[PDB]
C-alpha cells in the first residue's frame, strides 16, 4: 500500500505499464518558446466512478479533452492553443473477494472511430461527453453516432487483438489496480487540445462480472488521470 500524493491530491494505491517503453518528457528556440506550468496540472483528477454490472459492454474516454473542465488543466486548454502531456492513468476496481471478472484497460492512440450508419458523419458530441464515458454496445446500432459495438470497438478492428497498445489486465481474481503512462504520441511536437484527441482510454470487460444474490449488483471502476510534463506555448513577447 503506497499513498501517492501530487500537489493537493492524495490517492491510495496497491506494476506500471510504461507506454512504449518511454517516460513522458519535455520537448527539449527563441522563435517559439514553450511555457511549463508544473504548478498544479500534475495533481490527480479523479473522474466519476463507473458502475460495472453484469451487462456492461465497456466504456471509452477521449483525452486530452476529457479533462476540459478539470481545474487548471481544463482552464489552460482555453488560454493556450498548443500543448502536450503524459497522463498517468490509475484504474482501480475495489470489488470484493467473491466477485469475478476481467477488464482490458487500453489506451489506443489515435482511435479514429466509425459512424454507425455509414455514408454520413456524426455530430461531434457523440465521441465525447467530457467527464462522462460513452459506453459501448453489445450489438450493432444505427443513427448518426459512433458504431459502439464491441468486437469492433470503434475502429473496425477485432476487439480481442486490441492488446497491441499500452494495456493492462484487471483480473479481479488476482489484482484490482492498473496504471498506464502514455508519453504523448503525436506526429507534431505540439497540437491543439480541442481539435485532436491524442488517445482513447477504453475499458472493455472480456470476462463478464458475475456474483450471487447477496453481493452488490455492481463494481465501481475508478479512473484517475495525472497530466505529467504538461507544457504549452508562450504568451509573452520575445
Amino acid at each position: 500500500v503506497r499513498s501517492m500524493t501530487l500537489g493537493n491530491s492524495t490517492i491510495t494505491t496497491q506494476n506500471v505499464v510504461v507506454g512504449y517503453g518511454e517516460w513522458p518528457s519535455y520537448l527539449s528556440t527563441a522563435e517559439d518558446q514553450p511555457t511549463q506550468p508544473d504548478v498544479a496540472t500534475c495533481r490527480f483528477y479523479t473522474l466519476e466512478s463507473v458502475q460495472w454490472e453484469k451487462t456492461s459492454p465497456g466504456w471509452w474516454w477521449k483525452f486530452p479533452e476529457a479533462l476540459k473542465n478539470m481545474g487548471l488543466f481544463g482552464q489552460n486548454m482555453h488560454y493556450h492553443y498548443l500543448g502536450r502531456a503524459g497522463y498517468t492513468i490509475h484504474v482501480q476496481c475495489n470489488a470484493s473477494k467473491f466477485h469475478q471478472g476481467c477488464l482490458l484497460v487500453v489506451c489506443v492512440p489515435e482511435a479514429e472511430m466509425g459512424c454507425a450508419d455509414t455514408d454520413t458523419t456524426f455530430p461531434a458530441t457523440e465521441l465525447t461527453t467530457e467527464d462522462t464515458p460513452h459506453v459501448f454496445t453489445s450489438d450493432s446500432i444505427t443513427g448518426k453516432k459512433v458504431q459502439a459495438a464491441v468486437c469492433n470497438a470503434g475502429m473496425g478492428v477485432g476487439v480481442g487483438n486490441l492488446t497491441i497498445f499500452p494495456h493492462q489486465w484487471i483480473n479481479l481474481r488476482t489484482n484490482n489496480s492498473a496504471t498506464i503512462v502514455i508519453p504523448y504520441i503525436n506526429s507534431v511536437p505540439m497540437d491543439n487540445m480541442f481539435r485532436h484527441y491524442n488517445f482513447t482510454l477504453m475499458i472493455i470487460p472480456f470476462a463478464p462480472l458475475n456474483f450471487t444474490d447477496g453481493a452488490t449488483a455492481y463494481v465501481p471502476i475508478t479512473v484517475t488521470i495525472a497530466p505529467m510534463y504538461a507544457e504549452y506555448n508562450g504568451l509573452r513577447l520575445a
Binding site: 493537493n8 491530491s9 492524495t10 490517492i11 467527464d131 475508478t222
Partner: peptide, 30 residues
C-alpha cells in the same frame, strides 16, 4: 469502497458537488 475527504480553506465556500470537492484539496481514502 472509496471516500473522498475534502478540506476547504477558512475563506472558501463549501463544495456543493463531488467534482467541485475533487478540484480542491482532498484525499481519496481507499
Amino acid at each position: 469502497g472509496k471516500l473522498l475527504i475534502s478540506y476547504s480553506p477558512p475563506g472558501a465556500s463549501v463544495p456543493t458537488s463531488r467534482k467541485d470537492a475533487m478540484l480542491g484539496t482532498h484525499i481519496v481514502w481507499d
